[PDB]
């Protein structure tokens, strides 16, 4: 079931067992369950172009070419049913290596207890 | 079909590595399967961000307890 798959994904990403990722699973379920406004772009080519522009903006032309090649390979493989959604997700999760990661203050650890 | 899925997953992993996304092969396959089932990409991005924050908190806790 997709829910079990999401739980397993959370466990894999966190490196904890599914029982240890219950709060993260709940957070994910809450986020997915929230009503979202329609996505700006539901067109695979528009999402791909936005991802390419974002990759070029970070001066990662090699990474932009690699992304374009991976998108071409995914499109030819035909395994994904919603190419536009996956491309939009990948664009949304890209991070600029030049923008120094806003190091999550050690202070966040204070409230975890 | 299996070879096509493997090629797509390898391409996705290479793209994630070049873009420094931090996704592994299993996580990328799970995301691809979820996307094929119709999940909204904005909701998926928000969920991914929350999961990444939780994973970072868990990694910080594991590094503090070790």
């Amino acid at each position: 079931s997709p829910n079990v798959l999401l739980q397993n994904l959370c466990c894999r990403i966190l490196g904890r067992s599914e029982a240890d990722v219950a709060q993260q699973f709940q957070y994910a379920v809450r986020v997915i369950g929230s009503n979202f406004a329609p996505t700006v772009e539901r067109d695979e080519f528009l999402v791909a172009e936005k991802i390419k522009k974002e990759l070029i903006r970070q001066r990662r032309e090699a990474d932009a070419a690699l992304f374009s090649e991976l998108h071409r390979k995914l499109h030819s493989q035909g395994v994904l049913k919603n190419k536009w959604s996956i491309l939009y997700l990948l664009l949304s999760l890209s991070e600029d290596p030049r923008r120094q990661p806003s190091k999550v203050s050690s202070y966040a650890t204070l409230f975890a207890q | 079909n299996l070879n096509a899925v493997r090629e797509t997953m390898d391409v996705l992993l290479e793209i994630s590595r070049i873009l420094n996304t931090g996704l592994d092969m299993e996580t990328l396959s799970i995301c691809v399967r979820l996307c094929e089932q119709g999940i909204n990409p904005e909701a998926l991005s928000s969920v991914i961000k929350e999961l990444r924050k939780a994973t970072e908190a868990l990694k910080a806790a594991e590094n503090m307890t070790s």
Partner: peptide, 30 residues
């Protein structure tokens, strides 16, 4: 008073639309 060419008007419109879309997207993401 050299009238803005149709191409220049389209370019300016696309630039403004892109900036407004980026602002809307940033607000939506936030």
């Amino acid at each position: 008073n050299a009238p803005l060419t149709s191409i220049q008007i389209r370019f300016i419109q696309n630039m403004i639309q892109e900036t407004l879309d980026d602002f809307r997207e940033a607000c939506h993401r936030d």
